[PDB]
Every structure is written in structure tokens, then in C-alpha cells.
Design a protein around this ligand. Structure first.
Ligand SMILES: Cc1ncc(COP(=O)(O)O)c(/C=N/C(C(=O)O)C(=O)O)c1O
Ligand SMILES: Cc1ncc(COP(=O)(O)O)c(/C=N/C(C(=O)O)C(=O)O)c1O
Lengths: 406, 406
């Protein structure tokens, strides 16, 4: 069973004060902190075997290559892809989704075709499609939400038609905490002749991913949200789809033959990795996976279920506070205080050492759906505790009192 | 004056053996090693102030933002851009050039328009243009090289016409070591109504860059070649050009307003930075710049002039070896042994602890121009010494003897 003291001990950043109070970091949905295992992986790379990638040239070059390709296999195993050919290293979830929008959607959309998304999508999983449909003259449609911020499969079946070519949807909402029924949405997309594109930025850090079981056609994730370095992510795609897609970027490493005017591409996955890769970051992402696997994703998910249930209960103890989204959820709470702008909530909480985020959370259409212009969000991970949630709710109570007096 | 002992002391990776011999790393054109100042910058970021970017939310968030935007200013100063609006963080030189090819070239090319490049270009500065001209029905042309692998301005004037819209060329060749006359090429492009795109991946680490003096329209560089982290680079563009270019990628952070179907973009530079940025890497690149500035780029350039002159002289002492390119050059030597495949040269050198690269160096058209299928390359940086070059030439002599006997 997961010992939170022993876990927290591995994250040096947690052990400091802000404005004279112990740090209470509740913004892991914006980005996660790193354990020493990951930081020391980066250190060991740059101290010992940094070199460009390509085996059989020199000793450090081979070690760097083995580290990079080793990390690719770690990722394959971690999301249960069939093949390393299906695992592409990118700069992050946003780039991954843009690659699908550029290389897949822009080549498979014509007037009359639909791309179906949802009102709860992050911008990363909206704007690329807005642009893909404009370029092709296709139509963008939205699946409606139920009143508690979940999606009913009946509404999916209604919105998706035989003209739908792509359904794109979040696994987990970074605002509502909703866990969408991706496996069942994939069947509805496939039944209609569509592919499904899953935004896994908020799911992958926090619960097991099995792409064969989900049967998603594409899946995108970010390192920085799952204890890993910044600047790296993954695009998973089914091999038969990737084979038929053209590259999104061109250069060295992704070519086989280069003539004056024409070139041929390398096989997968390298076809989609142009230039010197994100060597250190990818290796550190592999170390993040190792670390998360050692703890156990199921264990992490159980911890967060407990935190979430505790937070929702304690928020219900506060008058004058609204929480958005459903009871069954991931480890985050987005809320507003009745008489206090969420930016001022965040400011006052930070003076008590508590880090939360305020704003639209890159989901302006969802904020409109919620009839608000902004919200505050506390988001959790494997290093957070019930005591920290106690601190949050006590601070929210004091916040209300403080703005009442003023 | 630059003390090479004190410089080498700061690079932990240099102090190890390969196959029982002291490491002799001569592959800095593939990638550079890092000093403790940069590694410790990454450490301090992840140990102390990692958070997503956006000021005025919480204390670590503001510190991360100030670090990231601080690094942007460091870069601006370093290449003498006018404005931080002209400094875009990317994943590397390759992505930077692809962004120009996508957002600039594909919007400003029609049948009859020309893109002019050179035979010595790296793939990163070939394939994006091949693709841009195919998409628009424009024409790709090549500036010819002189016999010593330099470019004459007369040939530039001949190749560039009033139908030329883009000239793209390397500052420094990663194979020939040629330093191209970029400032004079820019005047010829401008006189013809063209923009100039400069591939600065091999120049920026090794000599001062002044984009106002060069008058380049775009300039691309990589962190990993200039003592900085992997996975990060810069695209510089003149502000008036960037203003009129559309984004290459879409998502959070680069938007202002998002509706269901339409969005507006943020101002520069953020218009071109979609999603959570490369926070740690950018900060570490700023630390690489600080480190390089403290030593002095002119000092580094003088050291490499000395190494290059010494290497060329010592290579001329070897029978049965060909060196490609000119006498006046950057700090690298590409060569072949008369009777030995360069892959076998690299293998045998690595057993003596010496790291060089063999192959086409991502310049297959240049290899064809040279009438070879592959070459070996020794490339230098601020931590390398004449003693290391002695080791290289002694090993090449032994290599020749060894394959003669066999
Ligand atoms: C569900 C989901 N989809 C996409 C993203 C963007 O991932 P990124 O490219 O790593 O910024 C994210 C990351 N969202 C962060 C961020 O925008 O800071 C957050 O929710 O604060 C997300 O949670
Ligand atoms: C002149 C020049 N142009 C572009 C690049 C590609 O930069 P990258 O995107 O950091 O791989 C490079 C990096 N070339 C390396 C590499 O391909 O490993 C080398 O020359 O070995 C270059 O030197």
C-alpha cells in the first residue's frame, strides 16, 4: 500500500515555504512535480552519455540511442500499444493533436464530412479541428453535455452520423473531472465509419491506459503532467493509420533517400520524428513511467479517488461555494466562491502557501456552457494529502469571511 | 584569455574512458556537451520552481514564468534581435525551418515563384522547401558551389531572379565548414524582392550572431548544439513578417478568444507557441547563453580558428586522406581515408576512445556533389584541444596501416 510520506520525500520541490507557510501545491492539472528518480535521470544523461542518436558509430552515441529507443519501448508497454511503430515522441499533447489534424484530418475531410467534438474540450482539442474543417470545407459539430457535465452515449449516437469522419474527445476533463466513456464512444465512431482521437493529457498521469482495450485510433499525452520533463509528449496512432499518413514536418532523421526535388521517408515511427530528437526529455519520461509503474497506477488512482471524495464532501460543508461537474470524477475540483472573483481566491490562497489556478483553464466554450467567465481549480496527484485539502477548505472559509468584512 | 583546462573541468562527461582510453569527443557538430552551469539550472528548476507559465496566479507559477520569459530576453540579446516578439521557442532548428515553410512559404508561393537553396544544405533546410514548392506548384532551384565548396556571390546573383520569393541557406556548413556570406546574400535576395531564411544551427554555437547586421528575414538555431538542453530551439523572424504569418500549430496559450467555430490569436511571440511550453529547456538554453557569453563568443571562435588551422595542417601530413571544403572554415574536418570506408574509420577510432561521425551528415545532395557516398567527420568546440587532434591524426595513421596489413 502506497505510503504518502515516503512518496513526498522523493519530491524536493514540496519541501519549501511560500510567504512564510508550508507550500501546498494543488495545481498538478496545470503541471506535475518531479521525483528525484526523474531529475537524476536527466543528470546522468548529461553527465555521462549525451550524444546524438544512431547506433554503431561511437560508444556514447550507442548509449544515447539505446536510452532513447528504450524509452519508446517503455511507453509502448505503458499504454499497451502493439508496436513501437505506433509510439511517436512529440513536444506534447498539443503538438500530437495538431499532427493528427494536419496529417490525418486535412487529408480525409471533404465538404459534407463532419468532425465531432464536445463542449468540455481543452483548446488543444478544439482549435486544430476548427482549422482542419475550414481548410477542407467540412463541418464541426459538438456533442451536448448533461446537466452534471457528463456525456450520454445517446447524445453521442445522435451527434455522430455516417457523415462523421473523426470524433475527438477528452479521456478526462481538466475542469469537470469527468471520465468520459471512451471505449463505448470508440464503438459508436467505428460503427459510423469514423476514427476516434483521444486527448489523454489528464488521464495518462492518473490511471492505467490500455489503447488496445479502449480501441482508440489516436491517443495524445504530455510528460509534464505525469512526473516527467517538460517539452515532451507522445502521439499514439494505430499503425495502419500512421502508415497512410504523410509526415507533419520534414528534415533529417525522417528521410531514407533525398534527391534534389523528391525524397522518400523512413519507416515508422521515425517518419514522424524530424531532426535531432528530444533525447534527454524522452529518457526522463521513460524514468517517470518506471517510477509510476513501481508505485502502481491503480494505487495512484485509488489514492486520488479518496482525495476527490474527501474534497467534494468538504466543499459541500462550505456555504456560498459552487463546484462544477459530477460526483464520480478524477482528482480535481473546479469551483467558485459566490461573492469573490476566482483570481482573487487564487491570490489570497497563495499568501497562505496554497497554489491553485484561476481562469478559463483553456476551455472557454465550457466556461460559456457553465455560464461563467472564470473558475478556480484545485487539482491533486500522488503526493497530495487530506491535510492539504483541509488547509484549502479552511482557507476558502477565511477568504469568504475576509471579503464579507471588506 | 580562455583557459581550456578550466573550461573542460566544467563538463563532467569529458572525464571518463571508452574501451580503456580517455574519451576524445570530436562530434560536437552532431551534438554538444553541457557544463555544470546548465545541468544545475535544470536541477534548480525541477527542485525549486517548476510550475506552468502565467504570472499572478501563484508564487512558483510566477517564478517559472519569469524564468521562461527571462530566457526569451537572453536569446533576444544574444542574437541582437530588436524585440522578444521576434524570438519564438521551438523544438529545434528543424521545426523552426518547417514553421517558415508552412506559415510563410506555403502562403506566398504560386506557379512561377522560385525558392533558391544550395547544394551544401542540410536536409532540414531542403525537405521543407521541396514540400512547400510541390504544394504551391512553385520551382526549387540550387545555387552551384565552387570547386573548394564555397559559394560565389556571382552565382547567387545568377540563380536568384525577380521570380525568387525565398532564398534559404546555411550560415555554416556542418560538412564543409564553409562560412557563407549571408549578409551579402541577404542584399541580393532583397534586391530581387525575396526574403532570406538562414539555417544557423552550426553558426550560433561557435560565433557571434547579429541578426540586425546580417539583415536575415528568418534565422533558426538549436540548443543542443550550443551547450544547451535537447528538445529546444529558436525561430527568429522579422516582426513585420511574423505579424502577417498564420500559426503553424493551434491550441491553448496561442489564443485570445475561442468560440465554437472561430478563434483569434495572441500577439507575438505567443501566437507561435501552442500548448504548455518547453519550460525547463528554454531556461537551460538561457543558462547556456549566459555561460557562452561569460567565456566570450569571439574567444570561442578564435580557439576554433586555431584548432581548425592545426587540424588542416596535420591532415595534410597524412598520405591517402582527402579533406573536403575550403581552407578558411569553422571548427570541423570532413574527410575520407583512401582505402577505408568511413564507417570502419569511425568504429576503429571509437576503440581508441575517439568519437567521430560517419555517413552523409544529413546532406545526401552534397555527398553526391562531392562524388562520394559517405564521409567521416571530426568536429570541435570550446572544450577540445590540439592534443586531441594529435590523437585523431595518430589514430588515422594507425588505421591506414591496419587496413593495409589486413
Ligand atoms: C485535457 C487536456 N488536454 C490538453 C492539454 C494540453 O496539454 P499540453 O500540450 O501539455 O499543454 C491539457 C493540459 N491542460 C493544463 C494547461 O493548459 O496548463 C491545465 O489544465 O491547466 C489538458 O489537461
Ligand atoms: C547546419 C545544420 N542545419 C540543421 C541541423 C538540424 O538541427 P536539429 O533540428 O537540431 O537536428 C543541423 C544539425 N546537424 C547535425 C545532426 O544532423 O546530427 C550533424 O551535422 O550531425 C545542422 O548542423
Amino acid at each position: 500500500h502506497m505510503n504518502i510520506t515516503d512518496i513526498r520525500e522523493q519530491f524536493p520541490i514540496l519541501h519549501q515555504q511560500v510567504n512564510g507557510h508550508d507550500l501546498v501545491y494543488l495545481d498538478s492539472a496545470a503541471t506535475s512535480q518531479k521525483p528525484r528518480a526523474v531529475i537524476e535521470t536527466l543528470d546522468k544523461y548529461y553527465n555521462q552519455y549525451n550524444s546524438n542518436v544512431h547506433r554503431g558509430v561511437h560508444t556514447l552515441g550507442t548509449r544515447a540511442t539505446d536510452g532513447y529507443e528504450g524509452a519508446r519501448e517503455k511507453v509502448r508497454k505503458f499504454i499497451n500499444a502493439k508496436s513501437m511503430a505506433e509510439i511517436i515522441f512529440t513536444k506534447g499533447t498539443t503538438t500530437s493533436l495538431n499532427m493528427v489534424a494536419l496529417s490525418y484530418a486535412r487529408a480525409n475531410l471533404k465538404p459534407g464530412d463532419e468532425v465531432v467534438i464536445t463542449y468540455m474540450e481543452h483548446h488543444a482539442n478544439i482549435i486544430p479541428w476548427q482549422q482542419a474543417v475550414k481548410a477542407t470545407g467540412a463541418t464541426l459539430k459538438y456533442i451536448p453535455l448533461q446537466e452534471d457535465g457528463t456525456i450520454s452515449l445517446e447524445d453521442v449516437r445522435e451527434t455522430v452520423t455516417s457523415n462523421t469522419k473523426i470524433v475527438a474527445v477528452s479521456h478526462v476533463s481538466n475542469v469537470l473531472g469527468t471520465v468520459n466513456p471512451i471505449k463505448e464512444m470508440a464503438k459508436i465512431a467505428h460503427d459510423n465509419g469514423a476514427v476516434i482521437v483521444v486527448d489523454g493529457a489528464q488521464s495518462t498521469p492518473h490511471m492505467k491506459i490500455d489503447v488496445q482495450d479502449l480501441d482508440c485510433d489516436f491517443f495524445a499525452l504530455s510528460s509534464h503532467k505525469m512526473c516527467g520533463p517538460t517539452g515532451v509528449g507522445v502521439l499514439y496512432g494505430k499503425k495502419a493509420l500512421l502508415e497512410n499518413m504523410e509526415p507533419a514536418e520534414f528534415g533529417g532523421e525522417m528521410i531514407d533517400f533525398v534527391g534534389l526535388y523528391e525524397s522518400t521517408w523512413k519507416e515508422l515511427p521515425w517518419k514522424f520524428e524530424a531532426g535531432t530528437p528530444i533525447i534527454a526529455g524522452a529518457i526522463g519520461l521513460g524514468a517517470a513511467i518506471d517510477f509510476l509503474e513501481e508505485i502502481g497506477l491503480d494505487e495512484i488512482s485509488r489514492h486520488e479517488h479518496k482525495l476527490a471524495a474527501y474534497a467534494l464532501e468538504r466543499f459541500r460543508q462550505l456555504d456560498g461555494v459552487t463546484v462544477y461537474g459530477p460526483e464520480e470524477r478524477a482528482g480535481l475540483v473546479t469551483f467558485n466562491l459566490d461573492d469573490v472573483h476566482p483570481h482573487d481566491v487564487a491570490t489570497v490562497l497563495d499568501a497562505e502557501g496554497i497554489a491553485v489556478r484561476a481562469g478559463h483553464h483553456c476551455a472557454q466554450p465550457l466556461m460559456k456552457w457553465l455560464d461563467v467567465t472564470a473558475t478556480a481549480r484545485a487539482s491533486f496527484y500522488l503526493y497530495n494529502t487530506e491535510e492539504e485539502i483541509d488547509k484549502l477548505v479552511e482557507a476558502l472559509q477565511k477568504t469568504k469571511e475576509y471579503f464579507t468584512n471588506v
